[PDB]
């Protein structure tokens, strides 16, 4: 019945700090080292460091030296991870892990490499100072089938809904997931593939809706001048 | 700093044997781990100490570490085995992960991606901004790598790419954006978006003219 339960999701401003906790149970807290692995959205796993609850000695990855502090409270069977001087690329899912390895760097005489056998459910941390902001919409004009769309740019916070021709056009429509730019604002695109023969007769308007800001924008996507 | 090299994608059919490799300098000297991450949940340890299975892990999963490569092997692959797989080792007590490998159990034939490259709209250029939009659609398996080129030189800054998501037709789509100044747009003869899918590259090109 070994398990790790983590604290709730957090949104933080760049330059500040964030502290995530993790409670261990099902085994004697002082017997195994606990560490933190993070994962940027859509990226791989990135190890941050570990703490030995027996003695409190820590070992951090070089990339986070000077920015991270890991602590433990044996009475509550809880470890903490505090990351300071937050930047936009610190937006990630932060996993609490149990490392059965024995590291010299946290007081073990004989180094022994095992692995991370238990993972917590993860804590989502978002770094952005942005407030609620409606999006600006730009057209992705087209020149057999043609591709057209509209660019929903710099909004906050997710989500935004996109329909075409007040919902009349659904075939071939794809609305992509949003990407968090370093500015702290979200942006996505919505595409629809149409027959080229329709471009001179059929008007195409994408309808964006941003509920957090009560922003509704209709943008007409005209074909371009040239071929 | 030590690095582990994994192939970004590996595909098999139901019941076939999947093999995911992980390469590193003298990797056979070190201990390796393999983690399985299904969409939406935490990673799971499937192999530790090169070839040991934690209790409860199916015996289809096997591992081997020799020379400079570590290998995870899944015999008789099932649909539930679709996940990202990470190799992991240590470099002076520091934990190191491979880039990860997307494993796809093929449920349909492969499909080459369709690439459409949108120049910056005149409404954006008139607003003193410029964004290139590379839209990729109708490909399978859902794994692509996007590379931007200024004329013939690679661009690295200002590139943001989304993770491939499923369409309504069970095929995948992805997007990539290159933000630059309006002046960077006019100063080059052409910009290119290269989408490599299953070893072959499809590229589109736009120009400020
Ligand atoms: C056995 O040795 C350990 C050190 O290896 C001693 O633990 C240390 O105890 C001191 C005093 O309690 C800790 O400092 C204090 O922490 C408390 C936390 O509430 C704080 O209120 C105090 O102001 C002070 O900072 C110290 O952190 C702790 N060190 C470690 C590594 O845990 C322990 O006391 C020794 N046992 C005996 C019976 O002497």
Contact B188, B177 (CB under 8 A): no
A44, A62, A140 ranked by CB distance to B121: nearest = A140
Range list of H helices, B20-142: 122-126
Going from the C-alpha of A106 to that of each of A24, A31, A100, A110, A116, the distances in angstroms are 19, 13, 13, 11, 16
Range list of H helices, chain B: 122-126, 182-186
What is the total residue count of chain B? 209
* A61·B94 Cβ contact <8 A: yes
* B48·A117 Cβ contact <8 A: yes
Within its chain, how far is the Cα of B93 from the centroid?
27
Ligand 1 centroid to residue A55 C-alpha, Å? 9
Nearest CA distance, A211 vs chain B (angstrom): 23
Going from the C-alpha of B65 to that of each of B45, B47, B52, B77, the distances in angstroms are 16, 11, 11, 21
Nearest CA distance, B161 vs chain A (angstrom): 7
Token readout for B66 is: 């020799």
Which residues in chain B have Cβ-Cβ distances shorter than 8 Å to A140?
118, 121, 133
Residue with tokens 């093999």: B19
Contact A60, A48 (CB under 8 A): yes
Could you give the CA distance from residue A140 to residue B133 in angstroms, rounded to a whole number? 8
Which residues in chain A have Cβ-Cβ distances shorter than 8 Å to B95?
35, 37, 47, 61, 99
Could you give the CA distance from residue A100 to residue A106 in angstroms, rounded to a whole number? 13
Token readout for B171 is: 């095929």
Q: Among residues A100, A77, A87, A102, which one has the least CA distance to residue A26? A: A77
A42, A151, A174 ranked by CB distance to B137: nearest = A174
Q: Among residues A62, A83, A72, which one has the least CA distance to residue A126? A: A83
> Is some CB atom of chain A closer than 8 A to the CB atom of B88?
yes
Nearest CA distance, A43 vs chain B (angstrom): 8
Contact A155, A135 (CB under 8 A): yes
Q: Phi and psi at residue B184, in whole multiples of 5°? A: -60, -30
Q: Phi and psi at residue A30, in whole multiples of 5°? A: -80, 0
Ligand 1 centroid to residue B122 C-alpha, Å? 66
Which of residues 160 through 219 in chain A touch B, CB cutoff 8 A? Answer: 174, 176-179, 181, 187-189, 191, 193
Could you give the CA distance from residue B11 to residue B19 in angstroms, rounded to a whole number? 9
Q: What is the largest CA-CA distance in chain A?
A: 78
> Is some CB atom of chain A closer than 8 A to the CB atom of B173?
yes
Method: X-ray
A42, A103, A119 ranked by CB distance to B93: nearest = A103
> Ligand 1 pocket by C-beta < 6 Å: which residues?
A 55-56
């Amino acid at each position: 019945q070994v398990q790790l339960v983590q604290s709730g999701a957090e949104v933080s401003k760049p330059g500040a700090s964030v502290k995530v906790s993790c409670k261990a149970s099902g085994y004697s807290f002082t017997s195994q080292s606990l560490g933190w692995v993070r994962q940027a959205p859509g990226q791989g796993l990135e190890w941050m460091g570990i703490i030995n609850p027996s003695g409190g000695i820590t070992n951090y990855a070089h990339k986070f030296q000077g920015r991270v502090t890991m602590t433990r409270d044996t009475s509550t069977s809880t470890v903490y991870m505090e990351l300071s001087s937050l930047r936009s690329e610190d937006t990630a899912l932060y996993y609490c892990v149990r490392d059965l390895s024995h590291y010299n760097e946290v007081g073990h005489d004989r180094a022994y490499y095992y692995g991370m056998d238990i993972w917590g459910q993860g804590t989502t941390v978002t770094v952005s100072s942005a407030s609620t902001k409606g999006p600006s919409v730009f057209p992705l004009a087209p020149s057999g089938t043609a591709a057209l769309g509209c660019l929903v740019k710099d909004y906050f916070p997710e989500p935004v809904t996109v329909s075409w021709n007040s919902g009349a056009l659904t075939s071939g429509v794809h609305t992509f997931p949003a990407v968090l730019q370093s500015s702290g604002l979200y942006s996505l695109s919505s595409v629809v593939t149409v027959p080229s023969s329709s471009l001179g007769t059929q008007t195409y308007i994408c309808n964006v809706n941003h509920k957090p800001s009560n922003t509704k924008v209709d943008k007409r996507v005209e074909p371009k001048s040239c071929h | 700093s030590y690095e582990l090299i994994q192939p970004p994608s590996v595909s098999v059919s139901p019941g076939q044997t999947a093999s995911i490799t992980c390469s590193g300098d003298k990797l056979g000297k070190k201990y390796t781990c393999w983690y399985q991450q299904k969409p939406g949940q935490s990673p799971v340890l499937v192999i530790y100490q090169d070839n040991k299975r934690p209790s409860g892990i199916p015996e289809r999963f096997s591992g081997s570490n020799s020379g400079n490569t570590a290998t995870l092997t899944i015999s008789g692959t099932q649909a539930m085995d679709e996940a990202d797989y990470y190799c992991q080792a240590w470099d002076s007590s520091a934990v190191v992960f491979g880039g990860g490998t997307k494993l796809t159990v093929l449920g349909q034939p492969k499909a080459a991606p369709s690439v459409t490259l949108f120049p910056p709209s005149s409404e954006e250029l008139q607003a003193n901004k410029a964004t290139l939009v590379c839209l990729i659609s109708d490909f399978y398996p859902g794994a692509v790598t996007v590379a931007w080129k200024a004329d013939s030189s690679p661009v690295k800054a200002g590139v943001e790419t989304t993770t491939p998501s499923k369409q309504s037709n069970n095929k995948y789509a992805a997007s990539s954006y290159l933000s630059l100044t309006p002046e960077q747009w006019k100063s080059h003869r052409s910009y290119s978006c290269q989408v490599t899918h299953e070893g072959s590259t499809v590229e589109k090109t736009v120009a400020p003219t």
